[PDB]
Design a binder for this molecule. Sequence first.
Ligand SMILES: Nc1ncnc2c1ncn2[C@@H]1O[C@@H]2COP(=O)(O)O[C@H]2[C@H]1O
Ligand SMILES: Nc1ncnc2c1ncn2[C@@H]1O[C@@H]2COP(=O)(O)O[C@H]2[C@H]1O
Ligand SMILES: Nc1ncnc2c1ncn2[C@@H]1O[C@@H]2COP(=O)(O)O[C@H]2[C@H]1O
Ligand SMILES: Nc1ncnc2c1ncn2[C@@H]1O[C@@H]2COP(=O)(O)O[C@H]2[C@H]1O
Lengths: 383, 380
Amino acid sequence: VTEVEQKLQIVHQTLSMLDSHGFENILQEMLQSITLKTGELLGADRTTIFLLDEEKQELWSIVAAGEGDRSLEIRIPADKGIAGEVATFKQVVNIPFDFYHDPRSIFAQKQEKITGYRTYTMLALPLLSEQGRLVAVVQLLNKLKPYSPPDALLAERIDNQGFTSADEQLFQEFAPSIRLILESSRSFYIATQKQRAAAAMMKAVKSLSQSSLDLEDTLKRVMDEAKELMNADRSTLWLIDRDRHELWTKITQDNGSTKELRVPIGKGFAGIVAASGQKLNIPFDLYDHPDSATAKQIDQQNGYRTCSLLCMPVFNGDQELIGVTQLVNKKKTGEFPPYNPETWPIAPECFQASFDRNDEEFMEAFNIQAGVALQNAQLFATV
Amino acid sequence: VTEVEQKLQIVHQTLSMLDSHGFENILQEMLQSITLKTGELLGADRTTIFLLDEEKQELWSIVAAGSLEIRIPADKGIAGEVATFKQVVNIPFDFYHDPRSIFAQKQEKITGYRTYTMLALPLLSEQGRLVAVVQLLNKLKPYSPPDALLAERIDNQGFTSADEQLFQEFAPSIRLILESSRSFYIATQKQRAAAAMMKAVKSLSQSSLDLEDTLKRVMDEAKELMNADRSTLWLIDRDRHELWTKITQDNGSTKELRVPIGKGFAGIVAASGQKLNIPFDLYDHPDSATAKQIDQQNGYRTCSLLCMPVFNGDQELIGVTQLVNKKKTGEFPPYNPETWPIAPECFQASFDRNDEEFMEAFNIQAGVALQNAQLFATVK
Ligand SMILES: Nc1ncnc2c1ncn2[C@@H]1O[C@@H]2COP(=O)(O)O[C@H]2[C@H]1O
Ligand SMILES: Nc1ncnc2c1ncn2[C@@H]1O[C@@H]2COP(=O)(O)O[C@H]2[C@H]1O
Ligand SMILES: Nc1ncnc2c1ncn2[C@@H]1O[C@@H]2COP(=O)(O)O[C@H]2[C@H]1O
Ligand SMILES: Nc1ncnc2c1ncn2[C@@H]1O[C@@H]2COP(=O)(O)O[C@H]2[C@H]1O
């Protein structure tokens, strides 16, 4: 309560040390240099660092050796390959010559047909936090003989004895520095997210104390601000009717009309999010999505057209879902005439656009402010 | 690695929500209003919200309704009991007949307020951590004549089970204000920590300094920002059970200092793992014997000191930093060792707890350099 201003000065100093300095590049370039040196010292032809996108269940390479020292991004399902084995069970996997005689290599053999790279031997290592969380998977490919002709083909340059126990321990000279880059950035992301959530709650307290508006009008202001920042045509807060197992809301049209909408939980994108507690971001054109039947019927009834949609859950203090926000129709940049319902179901060019991952992160502060208001506005009014 | 720019834009969103809006006053005034309403509805003469300062081990009032700041040892009184055992305490009339009231009876001689009944409730998080102690005093009769004395307007049947339940209508709102602000404070400090690690990666990637000079650069920046005369990084001889460091004197000299772990402020902090902030004048402190001897040997004088632990990956101690002598702003004569033990005016100042929080970023940068500077240079 009494440290806000001082902590804001600390935030400003954090911005001074990071803003405009190209830290994504500094961090990625250093990671690349470490990986190169790690591979050189362990005698690997190629060295890859995989990260885990747990939202999409995929391992993707933040650093990965390519042909002619120009690198590409490898992306696989998090359960597949030796990389997936290391991600799941968090053991070192050492594959001796020849990897292709191992039945675990089937996935890799299919990927070779595309990449043109041939893996004979491998050392794959989990990078773990102190708690044992997966930070990354480091994969070293094709142990090399220390001396080969400079024009030698891969099959002649490989060392049939593969990677050794001494190589695995040598990797520990580098492991801490790799962890530092990956863990420092991750920790920055999480702290920034928790800081934002806390700030959004504080801002909601300020709104409720200073306003002489209803709950209804306070929630409208939050959704209208969200809509403006994200360049959405409309926005909506759906509330739960627990008794009937339904969502409801009151929309306002281009007319001067107040219409109530009601959808069963489980039906439509709002209903799906209410049932699952998990966001959905539906890109243009929403009408091509297999779950769009509900939108099609409501659009025709309202003289509107839903083309893109960001649907996110709103929670309690104790993880109970109490609402669902929607941003409706990311606006394409430019000037266009208003939508005319006589053209249905044709999508107007003005809504040929989609919400992205940035819109999702920026919307979260508005979701939190809505939730705080729903839970606390009645007590705040009494006071 | 690939989300730094997006997250920095989130930091700017956060600043736009909070900057220049007088939030310390908005939050405190709302907390005050909710406390007033809570006391009115439960019929308490007075209502207090205590917070726990963990480092000083004190309970202190952020709000009082029915106003001064009350401050007690964290283990004393009914408030202390609720902070420790985390259960509701309902005291019937008359509180003073209860042995547990002795502390309050002594506080009463000072404040002049007389407590007859009480309901003290723990406010807890999901995990069972203490957020606050809410203490309601002196249940009132629903009607008393306009100018009735306190003894005449108290209800001698005290607070009810229903009063306890009615409090839960206000508890969530109180939690919101206290927890949201706390979460912002902790997230901000953890964000600076991670930012300082990233900054170290930048420094070590673009550096041509060896380990010794890298560590000196970190400590020199630390003393510049917090206006200390000198600064020091002690390393551990984990073998002789000793600390060592190489100081540079105002002259152009190098000198090794050795302290047994356990002795001196550096040694105490190494054996315990807890920071110490020794205010002016450090020579008045019980544990200052080592500083006094070392000062005479160096022709120096230690007047204030901020001594902090430095850890590796898994929270094992790899060093101790010191900022030495917060400098008084102005222009003063150089310290002359012939004046010993007189403290010079240039060092008549102290480090505050804001310096402690800012210094953590340099502590982390030193720890990162110890573990990574040599490898980074090899790759470069
Ligand atoms: N840098 C790289 N270049 C080409 N192929 C790679 C690279 N890194 C990993 N791979 C291959 O990608 C495969 C994914 O499945 P595996 O992990 O079983 O085996 C992996 C390697 O054979
Ligand atoms: N503010 C709004 N104005 C008009 N239609 C809306 C608005 N918000 C949501 N909708 C529509 O309401 C529909 C409910 O089901 P869906 O979530 O599938 O798709 C939703 C949109 O098509
Ligand atoms: N707002 C207040 N005004 C006067 N006295 C108070 C107030 N709040 C708490 N106290 C007294 O401070 C005492 C501290 O010890 P106890 O918790 O035993 O009992 C507490 C009350 O008697
Ligand atoms: N850079 C420095 N220059 C001179 N004295 C120092 C320096 N750093 C630490 N000291 C002194 O070294 C002493 C070691 O024991 P203490 O930590 O008790 O107190 C410390 C200070 O008095």
